[PDB]
Structures are given as C-alpha cells and as structure tokens.
Design a protein around this ligand. Sequence first.
Ligand SMILES: [Cl-]
Ligand SMILES: [Mg+2]
Ligand SMILES: [Mg+2]
Ligand SMILES: [Mg+2]
Ligand SMILES: [Mg+2]
Ligand SMILES: [Mg+2]
Ligand SMILES: [Mg+2]
Ligand SMILES: [Mg+2]
Ligand SMILES: [Mg+2]
Ligand SMILES: [Mg+2]
Ligand SMILES: [Mg+2]
Ligand SMILES: [Mg+2]
Ligand SMILES: [Mg+2]
Ligand SMILES: [Mg+2]
Ligand SMILES: [Mg+2]
Ligand SMILES: [Mg+2]
Lengths: 853, 855
Amino acid sequence: RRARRIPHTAESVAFPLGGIGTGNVSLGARGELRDWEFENLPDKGRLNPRSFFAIHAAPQGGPSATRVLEARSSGRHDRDAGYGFDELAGLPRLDSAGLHGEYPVVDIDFTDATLPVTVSLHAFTPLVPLDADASGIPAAVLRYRVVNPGDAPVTVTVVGSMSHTAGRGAPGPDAPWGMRGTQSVRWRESDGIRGLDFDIDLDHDDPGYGTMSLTTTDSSTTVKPQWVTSYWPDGARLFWNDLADDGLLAPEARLTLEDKPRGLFAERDADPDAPALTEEQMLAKLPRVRTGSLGIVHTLAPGEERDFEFVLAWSFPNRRRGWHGHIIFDDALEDGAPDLRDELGPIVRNHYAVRWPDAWAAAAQLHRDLPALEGATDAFVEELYGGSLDPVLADAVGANIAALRSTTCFVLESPTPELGDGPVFAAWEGSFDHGGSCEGTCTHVWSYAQTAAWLFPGLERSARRAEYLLETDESGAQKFRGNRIFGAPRWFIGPAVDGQLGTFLRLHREWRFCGDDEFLRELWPAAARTLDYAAREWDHDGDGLLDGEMHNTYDIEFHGVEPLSNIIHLAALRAGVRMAGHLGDTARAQEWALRADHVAAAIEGVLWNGEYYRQVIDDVDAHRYQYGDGVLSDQLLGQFHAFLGGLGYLLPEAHVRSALDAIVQHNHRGDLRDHESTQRVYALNDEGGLLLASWPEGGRPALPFVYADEVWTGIEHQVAVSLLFAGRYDDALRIERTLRARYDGAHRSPWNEIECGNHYARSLASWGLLIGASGAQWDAGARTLSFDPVLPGDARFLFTTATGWGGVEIGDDVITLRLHGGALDLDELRLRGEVAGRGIHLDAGETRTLTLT
Amino acid sequence: SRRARRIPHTAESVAFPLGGIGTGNVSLGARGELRDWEFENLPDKGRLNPRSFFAIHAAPQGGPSATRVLEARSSGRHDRDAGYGFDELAGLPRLDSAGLHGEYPVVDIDFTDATLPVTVSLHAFTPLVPLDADASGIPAAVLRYRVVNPGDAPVTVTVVGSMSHTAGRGAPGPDAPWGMRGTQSVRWRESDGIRGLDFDIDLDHDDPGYGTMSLTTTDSSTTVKPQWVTSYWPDGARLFWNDLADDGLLAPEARLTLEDKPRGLFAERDADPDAPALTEEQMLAKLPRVRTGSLGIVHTLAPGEERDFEFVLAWSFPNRRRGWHGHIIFDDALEDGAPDLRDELGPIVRNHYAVRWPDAWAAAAQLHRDLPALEGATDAFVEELYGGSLDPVLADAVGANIAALRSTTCFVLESPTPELGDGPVFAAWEGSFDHGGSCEGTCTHVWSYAQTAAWLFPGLERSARRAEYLLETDESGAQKFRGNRIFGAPRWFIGPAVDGQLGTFLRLHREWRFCGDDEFLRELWPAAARTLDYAAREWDHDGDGLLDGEMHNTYDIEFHGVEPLSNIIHLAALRAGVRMAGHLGDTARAQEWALRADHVAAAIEGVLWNGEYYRQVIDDVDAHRYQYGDGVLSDQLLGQFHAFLGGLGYLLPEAHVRSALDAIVQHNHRGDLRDHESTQRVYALNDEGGLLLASWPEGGRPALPFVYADEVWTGIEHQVAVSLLFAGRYDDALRIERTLRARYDGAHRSPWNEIECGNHYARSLASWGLLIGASGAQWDAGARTLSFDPVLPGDARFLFTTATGWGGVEIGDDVITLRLHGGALDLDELRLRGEVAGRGIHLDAGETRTLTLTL
Ligand SMILES: [Cl-]
Ligand SMILES: [Mg+2]
Ligand SMILES: [Mg+2]
Ligand SMILES: [Mg+2]
Ligand SMILES: [Mg+2]
Ligand SMILES: [Mg+2]
Ligand SMILES: [Mg+2]
Ligand SMILES: [Mg+2]
Ligand SMILES: [Mg+2]
Ligand SMILES: [Mg+2]
Ligand SMILES: [Mg+2]
Ligand SMILES: [Mg+2]
Ligand SMILES: [Mg+2]
Ligand SMILES: [Mg+2]
Ligand SMILES: [Mg+2]
Ligand SMILES: [Mg+2]
C-alpha cells in the first residue's frame, strides 16, 4: 500500500467517513466504527450500541470461525462499569490491523493467526472536486474484501449489525431509557438496493428526527431485520448464537422475550392479573433503540477473492435555527437588523436533505452512481497522493480535507430569504467533542482556510455573500461572526482587522477563481466600504499605517503599529485595485493604488527592522498582550494571501525572504521539552512546532498576547506556504514534517488537526501547500492557468479551476493536462513564466500534451 | 530501594488514592500528578483541578536555575479537543520520568530527570489506623517531597504547591457564571500550629456543594503567593511562573485583577463605552470565581544533603443531600408500610467526619499535630501487610483493595435516621461510576462478599447490620437487599434475595464473633432469626429441606430448580445461627437449626453433588431464561467461603468441597481470553486471564444463561481463592490472584481500583479473606481465643486484627510471636495449628510476647 501503515494500537486514529455537511462516522485503526456524529453536532467517543461487522467463515469439511471484524483493543481497559453489554467487547476479534489512509479513501488490512480467510476493509464517502453535492452524500461505502488462501472452499458471511442513532434525550419522563422516541427497523428492497431501513417516530420537524440505512446491491443476503429487545441483552446472545451456528440469520419469531415486566423490572403498581400484554404493548415498555443485521454470503473457492459491499447511510435533515453556541448569546445581539426568526420558524434544513430527505435516498444514489462517484474519488486520490509532492506535503494537503467534511462545517437550505434560495455554507471554527466551537463562520479564522476555495468554491462564495450582504453595515464595519444567516440580529461585537480585510482578500480569491463579475458586483458596494473603513477608522495618525487598538485572531487587540494588520491591508489594497479596475470603479482603483504604494513604503520605513517586521510601540508592557520586537509568525499573513491571489511579493523580495527566514530560525522549535508556556498545548514534549511568537532579541512582555507560546497548525501551514512561494522549500518541508509528525497516529489523529476544537478550520490553510509547491495560478477572468513549481524537473500535481479539475504533468519539453471533471477553456497556459499553450480546451476524460518549444 | 514494584509514569490508568474512609479522595498518577478530584460526596474520575500542581525551583549556586513542574512528562494521547487548556499548565516543563511504588495506604513516587540539579521523590499518604475508623477517616493527605542534592555545589530549592479550591461548580446557566454558582476565597493563615492557604466559598454553609480546602505546612521557611491574579485571560498563571522562575521566591499580588472594567470581547453590550473604571472589588464580581494560591517551602541543600518539603492537603464537604439519589430506588419503587420521615428530618445529612472537623483547616491541624502517632501506626500497618511472608501477589490483593473501602463507594453518615438512634452509620454504593454512585443501598447480595471492613473497621459493619435488621426486615423475616430506610424514606418495594438475606445473617455472625458484644447481637436477634426461618418456610416448596424454585440473587436474575448457591449459603447460615442461638440460650432454635442443617447437608450431597461438583438440578435448563444446570458455577461454594471465614470449618465432606473447588479452577479459570466468546460486560479480555462466573465443560449450556456467566468478577475470583487457601489449594489460589491482579498491574487498569459495576467495587473487598485464609486466623471474641493455621508450612509473618487490638504474628515451629501495634489483646488461649501455644496472654500496644511451642 502507498499510505503509511498505522497500527491498530494507535488509539487516537480515526478515519472520518461522510461528506460536506453530512455529519460523520469514523473508522479507527482497529477497523471499528467510532465517533458516531450524524445529528448536526459533534460526538467524538459516542458508542453506537450493537453496531459492528462480523465474519463467519465455514471451511468445507473444517471447523467454523466467527469473529467481530475488528482488531483487538489495547490501551486502557478500566471503563468504570467494564465495557458495556452493547459494546460486545468480549466477542472474539482479529489479532491486528493496519490502517492505510489516503483521505477520502481508507484501507484497513486485518491480520489474524487462525482465521481461515484474510480480510480487508476499503471505505470511503465519494469526493468529487467542484461538485459540493456529490461530495456531500450522507453515506459511505464499506467494502470488505475476503480472500480464501486455503485449499478447500470456505463459505463466508460478512454481516453488518447496526443500531439507529436517533432519539436521545436528557434523562426523564419524556425520555424513558434515554430515548425521546421509538426506533423502527425493517428489511427493504426498492430503488435498486436492499437491506435495513431505520426510522423513528419523532415528528418530521423535530431536530432529532432522522433515518439510517445499511444496504447492498448484493443479491446473496441473509438477514435478521430486528434483534430481540428484552430487559437483558437477549438480542445480542441470540444474534451470535444464530451467526456462529451456521453463518446464516433469521428474523426473530418474537421481537421481545418478555411477557410482562417482572422481577427487578416489575411495575410496583401493576395489577398482578392484568390481561396479557400484546407484544406491541410489552415493546412499548422496553428500550427504544432497534438493531438489525444484514449479511452477505458467498462460498469462496481456493484462492478466490470477493468483495462484500455495504453502504451505510443516514439523514438528520432538521437543525434548530441559530448557532446555539457559546459566544453569540441573544443578549450579545445588537439592534438594527430585522429579527426574522419568529416568522421563519424554529428549524432550518440541511441542504443535503433536498436531494436526500432520508437515508434510503442517499444510499440509493450512492449505489446507483457508484461507478462515476468512485471513479472521480479514485482519480482524486491518484492525483493528490500519486504525483511528485513529497509524501509529507501530500499528507498535509489531503488529510486536512477531512476538516472541511467534518461537523465543523455545514450547508443550510435557504436559511434566510435575504440571500435568496439555495445552499449557504456556514461553519464553526472547530468541533468540541460534543458541541460546536466558536460560531459564526468566524472571519479571522476562516480567512486562513484555503481548501474550500479551491475544491468547493461555491460554498465559499455563498459565505462571502452572507458577510457582504448581511454582516456589513453602511459604514463598512463588518462583523467577524455572522448571525444574520439565521434571520437573527447581528452580534454586537465590532470588526477585527484581520477578519474584515481577510474577507476582502477572500472576495478577491473567490472572484479570481470563478470569474463571475455579477457575483463580485453584487457584493462590491459593501466590500469597497470595508476596505475604505480601514484607512478611515484604523489610522489615527494619518500616516497610512493602521495603528492603535485593533482586534485580531489572537482574541486581543494589538496597539502601536504592527505588521499583521498592515501587511494584510497592503494585500487587500492590491486585491482591491485589481477588482476596482476590472469593474470600472476607476476612482477607487486610483485611490487604492496610491494608498497601496504609500503603505508599502511606510511598512518598509517603520515596521521593517533590517531582518523582519515587528511592532513599533513606546512600551511593550504599557498594554497587556503585545509583542514589540518579538518575531510574530503571522507578520506576513498578508503575503500568504497575496501569493495565493496571484499578487506576488508585496514588499522587497529580499525583505520578505529575510522575514520568513527570521520566523523559521527564531520561532521553529525542534523539541519542546524546555518550553515555558502557561498557554494551551497543541505540541509538547519531544515534538516540535512553529511558535506563534518568540523574542530572540529580548523585549518579551510580562504578559504577551495570550497564544504567543502556542503552536497552531494553521499558522504553521500559512508560513510553510509562504516559504514555498519564496523558494524556501527545505524549510517549508521541515515545518510540515514536524507538524504532521504530531498527527502521525502516535498521539493524535492524521485526519484531525486541532486548535480550539477538533477539525479546526485554520488547518485548511494546508491547501496552499499544493498551490505553492506547484505555483498554480488560475485567473478565471483572464482564463489563464499557470504553473511554476518550486522544485525543478519533472512534476505531477492535482489542479483545480472553476470549470474543471485534473492533473498536470510537467517534463523538460512538454506539459500534460488531464481533466477528470468538468471542462477547461484556457485563453492561455503558462509554465515557469513562459507561454505553453494558447486557446487550450479539454473536456472531462481528455488528456493533452503540449510542446513547450 | 523500594519494596513495591516500580510502576512507570507511562501507565496512564494508575491512580494512587489519597483520602480516608468516607472523606472523598484525590489521587496521584504515576507521573506524580494530582488527579480524580472527588471531595464533594460524589465520584469524579477525570476531574481536573485548575492550576493545581507542585513545582520546583532549583537554583544551584553559580549555575543556571531550573524551574519545573514536579511531574513526569505525559506520554499517551495528546488530542484533547481544545488542546490541553490554560488551567492544566501542560506547556510548563516537566521531568523525564517517574516510578510509582504503592503500598496502600502509602506511596512513593521517585522522579528521574537529566536536567534538574536535584533529585526528587514524593511520599504521600492519608493515615490508616486499623480498628480506628475516625483516625482512618481524616479528609487530608500528607504530600512530602524529599529533595536530594547529588551535585557538587549548594542548590537553593523551592518546592511550591499551587492549589485551587474545588467547591462551587453549577450546571450551565445564569446563576453559574464561569460554571461557578459561588465565589471562592483564599487566604494566608497561621493558626493551630500550622501555616498555609485557607480556602472557602460564599455558598451557604448548608449547601450540599459547600466546603473548604487547605494547603498547609509546619515548615517555617515559606514563600507565598496567597492569591493569583484573576483576569479574563490567564494572567495569574503567567505572573506566577514569572515570579517563581525569576528567583524561586513568591510575593502576594498587589492587584488581584488586572482588569479595570470589562473591555473588548468581554465588554457589556449595553455598557457606556467611556464608563469609568470599576473598583477592584466590583471588577472581581464580574470575573471567574475559582481562586488559586501558592505555598512554597525554601531550603538550601549542601552537596549530598537531603531535605523534606512537607505539605498537607485537606478538605471538607460536610453536607449530603438526604437520600441515595441513585438510579434504582425511585419514588415509583417505594413500598407502602414504613412511614416517610423525610420531611420531618430535614434536607441535609452530614458526613460523620464533619462532626469532628468543622472545616479543612481543622482536619489539617489535627493531622499535623498528631502526625508522629498517625504516621507511626500507618507505617506499622504497611510493614505488617507488605513486609511479612505472604507472596507479594497476595499482599497486593489484600492491601491494594483497601482503597475501595476508603473510596467514594463508601461513606459514613451522622445520625441519618432517629430510628437507629444517634451515631455514625456506614453506608455504601456497590461502586462508583466516574461521576456518580453505582447501585445504591448497601446492597446485601454484593456487600456480603466484602470482608475488609469486618476485619479492619468492624464498627462500620455493625452500624450497617443494625440498619438492615432494624429498618429493612419486616415482621415475617423478609429483608430488603437495598436499604433506603437509612435516610428515613420508605423501603424499596423489591423483595428479598436469597444470597443477600442469608449473606447478611452470616455477616451478623461474623460481626458478633469479631466483637463479642452480646448486646449488639440481642438487639438484632428477633429480626435476624426471622430472616433465617424465612428461608426454610418461604423458599422450600417441596418440603425436602433444599431451597428450590424462583430466588433472586446477585446475578440480578432468579434461579429456578434447586441449586448450590442458595443451598450452601443456607447451610452456612444455619450453622452460624446455631452458634448465635446456642450462645444466647435460644436452645430450642439452636437444636432445630442444627438438625435442619444436618438434613440440608445430606440433601445437598444427595441431590446437588454430581460426583465432582455441585450444580443446578432442573427439568429443562432452557424452560426459564438465565439458568445454568450442569454448568460449573464459580459461586457454588460461596456459603463455604463464609463458613471458613466464620470459623465454621467445612460444611460438606472435605473431599467433595475440594473436588468442587478443583472443578471451578479446572473448568472456569482461563489463562487467556483470545478464544473466549461473550456477549456480556468486559472486565477481562484479550491476552488476560480470569475466573469465569460459569462454564459448561460437560455441555448443557442454556441458549440464554444467566446474564453474567461469561464475565469475570474480581470479587468471585477472590472468594474462590480464599476458599482454595482454606482447602489447602495454595497454588491454585495464588494462580487466580496472580492472574486477576495482572489485570490491575497498571498496564491497562489501576492496582488501586478493581472494577465491576463501578470503580472501587465493593465485591473486591472479598480480598481481605486472603489474609485470613493464608494465616488461618480465627478470632473468637466471645471465647477470647485467637488461633492461626497457615496454609503454607514453615516460617510466616502476618498482619492480624481482633476487636481489641491489632499487630503482627510471626510463626515458626519453634516459636510464635505476637507484636501488638495498637489497642490491647487479652487471650484465654492462643493456638497454632490446633495446639495451645499459651494461655492468659495480655498485651498492650507496643508490646511483644514470644511463646515456645511444645516439642
Ligand atoms: Cl462548489
Ligand atoms: Mg466525551
Ligand atoms: Mg423511513
Ligand atoms: Mg443462523
Ligand atoms: Mg497610522
Ligand atoms: Mg511520541
Ligand atoms: Mg468533448
Ligand atoms: Mg471542450
Ligand atoms: Mg468522565
Ligand atoms: Mg473558612
Ligand atoms: Mg519571585
Ligand atoms: Mg415460596
Ligand atoms: Mg426444596
Ligand atoms: Mg498469556
Ligand atoms: Mg497487556
Ligand atoms: Mg523452624
């Protein structure tokens, strides 16, 4: 296998299935399902009762074997009440496993000393670049490949057993058995698929309502649609008895073995010769989760390999209207915007529910379209992980896509009439284990996130329209957390300099990617105002440099004069000139171009110290949370945006390189055992990482900004991307190797970079590594595509554009474009600053090799 | 040189619990970290106490200083969802490694580090004084850091404890800003011969969440920051570390907040933007409500010098909400009969320890003032339990499991019900979930397994027997197996369990035999005798003397047919009944019971014995769910465990008892569980071993056997190993114990926490019987006789207890020595291996007597 084998003992490792906005379930390195979080909230560590795969292998004329299809557990076994009944941890398992993840696809290869067959699991949820719907199906393929390496036929049953997740409620008389409603399960065969269809009797508009399914297209099935529900776990024992007996299953004659509540379960007030309860009446007194099993049965010849293919699908269509987070409280709202919530009502739907209002619909789609969906997914994996990128960089780019497809992000169906009809992308900053982290598609965080802008640009556009149409007032003040997507009044807190101007940079990015001038024009009156706001409101001494108190991503305000704000502003001005001039807004184009030149001069005159850019302040201790002559890792965040936006260097190339080099030299730690931090920990011990700031020349405040001693993968990524554009390949690679080692499975999961929450949005800065490594520059307005790889010689990269995606392959004398999705109609193709092709058009499925001479 | 085997700092499960009987607890991990902060009348495994940690500043003369948290480095998962948070101070430098050496109640944690210019060890304990439940119930612990200077220059060392109070948390909402329903306080205090930090909270004194804490020393060489800065951001910790790492000295903060008014993200929406600053007091009212302080002790160590930096951590949460408030005995499960006193009695029951000690400081002051005697007793205990002849495996099993008795699982109430009169009453959960009690009501079917308190704190067990007989036993002799009436509530409506009810009667005999108090027995005797007669009357439907048909038991199901668990317990109960009846002059009842017992033993042999073991006789093992038939039930001879411990000897032919025990071992013990198939709960798995509850070596497995048959319970493992020691099957006892304790050797589970339905599970207290069976200790307080009969020949040395006193017994063929460490002992006879060693032996604490044995 190409991916690195992660052993079954790496307990943190979780490979997430599910798509954009769908919610998720993960596979651990034991091959177990974990982190069941379908229900519009995170739920790391949620155990789904009785939900597992199992194998019965019956060698012809030989003893049978029956195992759960999981490697052995390891680690702490001191659960407070033991592993519970519903975990079935006492059933026999496979000795070991290795997990090989190339997100969105995983392979988990099992090893066992005695099982008479060998097993692997291939799993994925499709990902189709530029197709957010196809990439947002609430379902996953679970495909178990079984090999008979023995000399006699083996009859193999692979059986998924599953419980629906819906229905939990807080303990109480409205939630007997912790369940607010009662589940159902049945066998179903319709829509070209067969299997188990789960439901619940909650109201159609209850936020907790949802469905699940476990299906196959395999005709060779054996089923127990509904396990027995008794007070004791009879269901499970009967299931195992049924499976290990013969590798076949039957429906249960009786759905409960209780006649009436007795012994410990007796109702104190029951009439002791009440009439017999019907089974339905007895079921009404019992636990409300339901479980079924779908088995697929094949006799494998000596040597034969066969796939046992399932789909697991789910649908929780209803969200409560509002973030219901921990920041934007209904008493932290400012007056001024109409409160639409009573009129619009208490629910907003997930977008995915328009096509797939229940699990069956999603399953049926995934099975019907599997060749194309899988074909796309596989082409994506091959381009992303099978080209010339160093494996570390492919890992950083690819694995972090998981954040975009996690509970951190979601897509709402028409949440507010003010944006018109259609999907609106919105996101937390991250996911706490059990709730959202930091609501409002936070602009100072999300400005670092690049992945969606290149893979699902539609989503990012929908978000920019919320910020400009709803969250930007007449003066140009833009909220950095948005509440108006729900119809709710705005958050009362004011603008952040990085969030407001980062948003403006993202408007440029979005427009550059799609080429849609109408998109830009709609947002332009508000966007221009936000750029004007900065020079007017944030420069108190009229020198062109933003100064004094401005709020930033560090949750504090910087004072004095300093590069984070100023270099972002410089980039925004440059972007603003491009957009203004294109749109014919000649007054702003001129005004901003003058301003930009003046700012760049003033940055070099004031903030540059001959090695890096730093904060000019009278007294670094006069206000808490400053940094002064410290080296701020984000000093050049503006330049990261500029490189990615095709704006090149904002400042003298040698000065930018010096500054980057200072960041690497001073702020990168190979080992953190001696680091003296009172802050949050995302790197420690024998790990390394880029610090947010350090003070190599002294001047450390008593109380520096409150995250200065921390390590943020997002900042690591942005700096590495800048280093790539600057030609500092070795250092970018070292940053990325070091940070991804913290996420190699030993202590943290590859598919979950963390900050304030799991699947943290800043981690999506990582996509810029592909861009920087390849020097990809797509301008949809010019219809030009160019590459300029940092490393010389032969190369092969994934690329995206608005209209199409594929692979680029570069040699001495030729460049090849192969398109896997959509279409490409280039005015011009450039390689290393030279014209490689004019008028170059390709359709999906076509390859063109162009001579460079 | 440490006697306990070294547990590495990488063993994440390991937690050495400080605290005493009924006090609540905090634990030490193998990194030397404090963890599992659970002082407040409920379990709380995994609760992190913000800003609560020890650190060292080591300033070598003429060398670079080192400032470190006095913990080894963490080593497992680091993927906390938000990172390690500010208040964990996980980004401060730590030590390369540590080795934990626990001989409960004492622990030593030895740090190793390549950069620190001194070497550090932590010695910690909460005193344990056998037979003194109060002295063993101090809500405090000693934390004594030994620092050695192995280098070549003097080093000025500061060892600093920083600590937050735990009190005040509230459910999310407007009255719990920052998650805190009250505001804590901390101050420097010097009083009662001690000094340090005194923590309080502005909750009402009767609030269940009210309490205090203290961190004190008697060292005069202190440096202190009594109250860290409270700002919106964690300025306090930054200032703390700047202050420590600068010079190893601390100062009080001139400003208790660095906020002038709420600003920025914390600004109040409606505030006037140019509002003036608030006072410091008004500003603190708007800020987080936990308070932190730091007590440092400073000494300069010459090359080769060592010094103790001694702290005491103490706490007090005096108030419990009246009632179990568990998950079984809800209002819809309450019986009409006994009237509801709850409204008449008032909403709070106090912890017993809160009678003696008003607050944390009081308990700290006691512990410091009395420390030489308390520690002396504790050290003498440790030496007898762990420094004698027992195989270390056995000493481990006996001593580690005491933790359960001193955990949140158990507590002691001040006078919860007028119906028992005034005084402390012991009560217990079966266990402790991570964040709540497991299975309320001093459950009798579970607690009948527990032996530790009956030998170490018998008074506690007597107080509980009174609740059962006076409160939970009706006029027919039906006894509840979960007791709600201690709180003045109606009884639970569920009826008796055969093992619970008869197990409690066996424990009455046990308690009476230990103490020799006929008045204790007489008060309970009418109720107790009715509970024994209840069995033969109500549970034998075919007149054969054997209990038959539907009887509920510890497996939470009912056995049908006729089967040994019930019947061999009954046999044992009858034999104990005869002793008690005979002594009290209830001569007619003694005779009746003796003859009934003779008939029961004969019927057991004639019906339940199959030539190899005892089993369930039933027409169809599948006619009723949850049976076992011809399976081997590990608990078949539980009655015989009681009988052995109660001095009653073999209940059945010796060869048959040994055969059955051998069959339990042979059939139900597993060295490895890779091949095991269980749809049940997991307490043992994979490459572990254990004793299964049942197995079917000759077939006859029901489709749905009892619901725990395929499980492994340490309590059952212990009871069987105890019986095996009595029966002379030492090797097999040791094997069961070796295998079970290996499950709790720190690799996957903690030595100090055997688990079943909950942490610190009461059944694990069967482990005390290993000492009794290994030593063959037989104490009869009514006869004033003490005998030993060790399973292994030759020289031996054991802990022993009696009602009046405790100590060490040293045995050879030439002499037997008693050394009494506490109390007194007045023996009419001392016997060894059935022979009189001496008569008229009178010892006081601190004395020894060595008797030469006859040739
Ligand atoms: Cl899109
Ligand atoms: Mg959790
Ligand atoms: Mg349905
Ligand atoms: Mg079958
Ligand atoms: Mg200025
Ligand atoms: Mg490591
Ligand atoms: Mg075509
Ligand atoms: Mg075309
Ligand atoms: Mg917990
Ligand atoms: Mg006080
Ligand atoms: Mg100082
Ligand atoms: Mg009866
Ligand atoms: Mg009978
Ligand atoms: Mg082994
Ligand atoms: Mg192991
Ligand atoms: Mg000798």
